[model samples]
Target: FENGLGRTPQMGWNSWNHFYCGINEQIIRETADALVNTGLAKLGYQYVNIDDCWAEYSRDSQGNFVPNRQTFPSGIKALADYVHAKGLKLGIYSDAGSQTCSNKMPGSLDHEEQDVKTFASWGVDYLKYDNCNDAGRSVMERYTRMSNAMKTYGKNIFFSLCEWGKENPATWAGRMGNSWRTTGDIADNWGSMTSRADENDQWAAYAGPGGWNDPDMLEVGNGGMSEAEYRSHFSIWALAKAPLLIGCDVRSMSQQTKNILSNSEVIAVNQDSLGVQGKKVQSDNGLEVWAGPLSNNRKAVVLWNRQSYQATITAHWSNIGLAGSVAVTARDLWAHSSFAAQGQISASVAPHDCKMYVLTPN
Candidate 1:
């Protein structure tokens, strides 16, 4: 009943660092406008998520939500409508605990129905539910309650659970929401990207339709990792069937970032709606690689050197059911380049480097 994640990994901008609660009606309006003007929205990026800080300190007398006066002067409802007018989706953030990731705003908790209704009334299309202080409670129950609330509230918003796998939230998430985060918060740095990338190998089985194991957001074209590592991050997330939420400022994005974000080759591999997340097929010397098959008969592979130094990245063609004399071609997802039909792809990955490829069988 919850087929709301679209056919591919969801993508678009997140405003945790730039806007924060500092986001006002103008910033959201401008970002929404920029999304349309920059053609990012057309590239299958529809969610312009306004992370923490868009909320008021407390609910009103009638239990209606109030926007933070300091930031959202004209209120979020108006802003959400404005975003919708821009041909984009508007996302709001809230926590399952009594506090948020930033620890400033309070959570929905017992007020699930009320909060969900408030978001629905505001034309909200996406909800980024976090796990800041959901200690000692049935994490699954908290998620289910909210899922029910949104369903009853008359909105088809995407519910994203940010449990970080602390409570192993994927056990029943498919019955409750669209996606659930599997990793801790991601930072804008190479170490953070590589570290988070490594963590995804262990949680591959938890990802699928109406329930994705999010490894946080995408770090591609953000300069945190080299072009190769960023490609690896994007590729693995796609292969893993994780949500493709981009965390960078999209307005000033570099061309390289654009290419990575808009790569059709990678996107096609990820849109395999079977919704099956990839599995790690090889690992050596602190380095690991994963592969997932797309419904379109292609294969997605990601390789990373988790430790310091170059590591050998190899894929056994036989495992993919290929024998000698087979013509297989590869497309480098990060570089947006493709290799002519070849039998095998072997490369040396330096420390923190990643290699993501789409192997087409011929």
Candidate 2:
């Protein structure tokens, strides 16, 4: 199934921030329906994931997992089937500890095989294997063990290692699964957003096909930051070819966030099958720049202003690995409009704001 998703990152929704542990069949149905109805699915969000608390406090009589009766009366199978009926995938969560991140529900430590079988039986397509406990043993050991259990039991599930950068999980998680989180939790604030970008820059060498440096999920249109900052966040993610798992309340996101998320030119860099993750090429004062090479000999650049006030940011041709008169098609990824650049590009970026651009050889 990983191959079915091909080399591009998997786009989807999770029910942690908004829904939290308040998920149910109706919420799942509505989210899935909304993804297709509101046109988010067409734009590439295809999975409706149920985060922690969706499972029962104890396993069923046959050692199989059970959905929390209060939250999911019809059971996880029904929900997965319902989501599948909408042409989408279903994702569930579990931890490597005795409990999940929320400190409730089951863990995969001793229940690996049983839980894997149960998730497979319910038609779960993706698993968000989290880390909340497992004090002495290594995260790699637990993650690989659970991942192997999934591989041997289920048909094929997208394994997302959520270790929060401990022991450098992204370095080798690819051999057992898909993307792994390369940073800590992503807050909706501008400081959290910018720092995440800076942190991931150091790990550019470890990013490529079947693996990526995940700076957490998308915050576009989430309202904690201004439209400009959100655009910068989107731009950086696109240039890095990071998985665009949006964390906003999609049902009522602002047009600006939607615009940044839907920019096709930037999206092209993220979905570029070349398997290259963009790297930070330059930084000065309150400005930072990142660039990624595309399979078609083009380049994607994201310029950001880290100041509390707006400033003009620049991405020189040489800095971005482009030289000798490059043909550049620039887009204000946040503005969702294309801009013409004869060769080089520069723009005035607002405080906590961003600009995303693409360049090709002339």
Candidate 3:
């Protein structure tokens, strides 16, 4: 990952989760404004990613992807300009195979060079290349071709591999792209969210400064989960150092959703300069302790309760790899306040709920 980008997990907004293909130029522009107006941009949420279905059904006569004129009207460059004007970056999505998974939009397989140039020229700051209808070619080969093209184009665009973790891309994709999806798309439900998190947690060793294991976008505020569930969802993603891409429509998201997404104290764990991916340090029954190292000898710990009933979860310093004898000053990220100092952190978490704390060695 010599691209000198994606030093930490990418934090941004993605369109597919909430809006799907039901997007337009006006909606995207307004969402970009919302990201800024909501004060999220100041807290390190900067990339405005448009997922699949943004393109016309077919490429132009010269075989170049085109934004749907009826929707985008002014084209991606104009939208990128608008996003940039507000001091944010623009991201786009495509597939590696013959067509996209959703709209069957033309994929960028044989057209890697052309598409990379097109994306760079239009000022796209990130690319979430997906895996679908791939022409039965090597996944690594297809993705490498695009990354090579990106390198040749000399643009700083972040390369995100979206092969759905079928081939265990985490084992080899670290140097090829900034991040790789380690699981299939996440649903706005408890089962899908927890399952994706479990699958992604095993690949903690593969994540670091430039490359990360993505479990997919945030499902917060989608109405399929309650406030506590969404908070747990957000907590787990942030602790895992997964890319915090918003999957809900930002313009009209509820204040609870806004608070969960915009909690700078929680975001610090994901965006920490240490770039360490957290893992399940201790799992017993449905209660779990996940810990990730932070800069300055700090640690971010999550007391997660996945049981059907409320329970108390503890993150002992010994289990978190911190010295048990050392009392640590703890900041309750969700509460956004300081808590009593102790050798271990404990909390009574509701079912499918979590409490995240940043511990500073005292």
The candidate maximizing lDDT is 3
lDDT of 2 by residue, 1-362 (tens): 24333257778888775667777777878888878877778877887888889878877788766788888889999999999998999988999877788776877787898888888899999888888978577887888788778778864677777888877755677776777877898888888987787787778777777666778878776678887777778778877767788777777766676766767667777888786888888889878888878777877788877888878887888888877466667655545677667646778877877777766554
- What is candidate 1's lDDT per residue for 32-124, written digit by digit as tens? 887788777887778888888876777779876678888888888888888888888888899887767776677888888988888888898
Candidate 3 stretches with Cα past 4 Å from truth are none
Window of ten residues with lowest summed lDDT in model 1: 1-10
Ranking by lDDT: 3, 2, 1
Model 2 residue 352 CA deviation in Å: 1.7
lDDT of each: 0.74, 0.77, 0.90
Lowest lDDT 10-mer window, candidate 2?
1-10
* Candidate 3 lDDT by residue in tens digits, 1-362: 77899999999999988988788888889989999999988998899998888889899999999998888889999999999999999999888878988844889999999998999889999999998887889988888898898888836899999989978989999878999999988998989999999999999998999899999999998999989899999999999999999988889989999999999888889999999998999999989999989999998999989998999988888888787687788998887888666678778999888888988887
TM-scores for candidates 1 onward, in order:
0.88, 0.93, 0.98
Model 3 has a clash total of 1
Q: What is the C-alpha RMSD of each candidate to the true structure, in Å?
A: 2.7, 2.1, 1.1
lDDT of 1: 0.74
Which of 1 and 3 is ahead in lDDT?
3
In candidate 2, residue 220 scores what lDDT? Answer: 75
